Amino acid sequence: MEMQLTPFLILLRKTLEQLQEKDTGNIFSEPVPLSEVPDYLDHIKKPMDFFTMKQNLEAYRYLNFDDFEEDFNLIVSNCLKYNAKDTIFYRAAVRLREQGGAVLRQARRQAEKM
């Protein structure tokens, strides 16, 4: 965390865009609609989605890379937890984990250069 804030935020914005690009159906773009799943919060302690991540970023809630990555990992893990393995949603979370992990490793390399 020994670096300047502004270049770090620029990197997080770019990284978040790269992660969202992997979600081609935009199914992780907004909060899971709780009005449609009244049991969702019985299973999921902390819902997450890319719009919430963007709000958190601009509110200065991500001041280290690990906190940003942790919220991305919640998007994936919540979806794996709630949805059955035979669903497209579950498989899309697996694919996002794979593609997004690669985006995150490269972004972390860039953060280390700061």
Ligand SMILES: CCn1c(=O)c(=O)n(CC)c2cc(N3CCCCC3)c(NC(=O)CN3CCN(C)CC3)cc21
């Ligand atoms: C099962 C709970 N659920 C998850 O657990 C989850 O991880 N995601 C993230 C992959 C979910 C994502 C959505 N979408 C919200 C609308 C955009 C498409 C994805 C919904 N939508 C609905 O429950 C209602 N939605 C059914 C499809 N119809 C075309 C429109 C009305 C539930 C999700």
